[PDB]
């Protein structure tokens, strides 16, 4: 509707429209599930590569800019699938870029001193850690009009932020199923070169391809250009 009453005659604060405030707040970036036994868990571990283009909500927000630079704060909210908590010791390991990821529930990777790991009990309050600006370049870039060497187009590996490897501690498998929610917050944001806002549904994580038969209009329609 359009109720034309209650007119805001004061200017609001510009702080609210600042790049920082626009990209603040911890949002859910991933939901890992490690059941006792089902499809992908006779393993006992999980490897989640840090990915932002996961949720279209946040992705659209980022693709408003060409380059971005920032730190990331990760919070690990875990519990059993029904919300119950048990005295289970877990380990979250950060495998930097260029480092080898665990390939089994007990690879050497889990003992490698250089892969920082945080140990916490599912009873303890959520673990929290900050990851810096990993790129070897001055900024992450959501668009690369070149090739890093076709099927490898637009792909820039200098945005690779790392991997998080989750697993229960202990030599034997855990009796409990675990559902872990990963929250991320962008700190100290800086953005460059603003670009048009995505107006077509997303088709893939790694590229702007859009459905070309069903091209949606940026705006809704009306009958005549005079009817309002």
């Amino acid at each position: 509707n359009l109720i034309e009453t209650r007119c805001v005659l004061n200017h609001h604060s510009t702080q609210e429209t600042a790049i920082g405030n626009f990209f603040s707040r911890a949002g859910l970036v991933s939901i890992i599930t490690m059941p006792t036994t089902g499809t992908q868990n006779t393993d006992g571990y999980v490897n989640w590569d840090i990915d932002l283009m996961g949720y279209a909500q946040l992705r659209r927000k980022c693709e408003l800019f060409t380059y971005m630079r920032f730190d990331a704060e990760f919070t690990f909210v875990v519990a059993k699938p029904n919300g119950e908590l048990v005295p289970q010791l877990l380990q979250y390991m950060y495998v930097p870029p260029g480092a080898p990821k665990p390939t089994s529930r007990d690879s050497f990777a889990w003992q490698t001193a250089t892969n920082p790991s945080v140990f916490v009990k599912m009873t303890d309050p959520p673990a929290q850690v900050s990851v810096p600006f990993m790129s070897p370049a001055s900024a992450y870039q959501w668009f690369y009009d070149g090739y890093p060497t076709d099927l490898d187009y637009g792909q820039c590996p200098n945005n690779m932020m790392g991997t998080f490897s989750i697993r229960t501690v202990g030599i034997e498998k855990s009796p409990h199923s675990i559902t872990l929610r990963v929250y991320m917050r962008i700190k100290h944001v800086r953005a460059w070169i603003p670009r048009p806002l995505r107006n077509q549904p997303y088709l893939f994580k790694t590229n702007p391809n859009y459905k070309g038969n069903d091209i949606k209009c940026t705006s809704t329609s009306r009958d005549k250009i005079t009817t309002l």
């Binding site: 060409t66 380059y67 790129s135 370049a137 001055s138 900024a139 992450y140 870039q141 668009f143 690369y144 009009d145 070149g146 090739y147 890093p148 060497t149 076709d150 099927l151 490898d152 187009y153 637009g154 200098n158 460059w192 070169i193 603003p194 670009r195 048009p196 806002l197 995505r198 107006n199 077509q200 997303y202 088709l203 893939f204 590229n207 702007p208 391809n209 859009y210 459905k211 070309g212 038969n213 091209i215 940026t218």
Partner: protein, 239 residues
């Protein structure tokens, strides 16, 4: 930029001379002038070649013809001059490249013609396809001197509204008034020097927003002429 009631001028840079009206109605991309790369450890042990020879001059590309049904065109940089002149062989023997550009799009039409072109520069112009998964071919990602034609101009072949392309360095060419646009583009990247053959720092788009029209009897195709001039071009081979 340039229109009627502007004193005609003859600019020369090297062995090139273009006659174009002096209209200080120029667009300077993102507010910055093209400059020579600040110091970096890499070219601090191997200075960057700055061929002011036949590299800093006016490269006038082949003229494109605008008809009543044209969808628009686009060229990628530095790709466009990769296959041309000393900027080409200079951009192939050298590992690292860096440069800026004075871009000049120009029209030639009669006062009985009508139309409006939008000229814009879009950094990191990545393209998409109609789709299944299939990253666009090398022939449409790097079109060369000829340039390429947009297939879905409304979403710029990348799923983004043309209606919003103006948040990028642009300049309109309304046949009614001015017949030419000028844009100064500075180097933009996440690192001082990139490969001139792998990465295309940006794209030049010329899309007709208000279609060409005229009465039958007038020249049916209006010529769009693009002239490029590298500014503060640097090359670093690392030897």
């Amino acid at each position: 930029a340039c229109g009627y009631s502007d004193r005609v001028a003859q600019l020369t840079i090297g062995n090139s001379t273009i006659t174009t009206q002096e209209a200080a109605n120029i667009v300077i991309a993102y507010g910055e002038w093209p400059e020579y790369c600040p110091d970096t450890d890499a070219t601090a042990v191997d200075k960057p070649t700055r061929p002011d020879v036949s590299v800093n001059r006016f490269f006038t590309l082949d003229t494109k013809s605008w008809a009543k049904d044209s969808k628009g065109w686009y060229w990628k940089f530095p790709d466009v001059l990769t296959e041309v002149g000393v900027f080409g062989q200079n951009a192939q023997f050298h590992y690292l490249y860096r440069s800026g550009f004075c871009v000049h799009v120009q029209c030639n039409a009669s006062k009985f013609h009508q139309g409006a072109l939008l000229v814009a520069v879009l950094p990191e112009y990545v393209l998409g396809t109609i789709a299944e998964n299939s990253h666009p071919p090398y022939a449409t990602t790097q079109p060369g001197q000829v340039g390429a034609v947009l297939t879905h101009p409304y979403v710029l072949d990348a799923g983004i509204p043309l209606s919003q392309l103006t948040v990028c360095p642009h300049q309109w060419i309304n046949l009614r008034t001015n017949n030419c646009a000028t844009i100064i583009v500075p180097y933009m990247n996440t690192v001082p020097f990139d490969s001139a053959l792998n990465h295309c720092n940006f794209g030049l788009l010329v899309i007709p927003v208000v279609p060409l029209d005229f009465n039958t009897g007038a020249t049916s195709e209006i010529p769009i002429t693009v002239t490029i001039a590298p500014m503060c071009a640097e090359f670093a081979g690392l030897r």
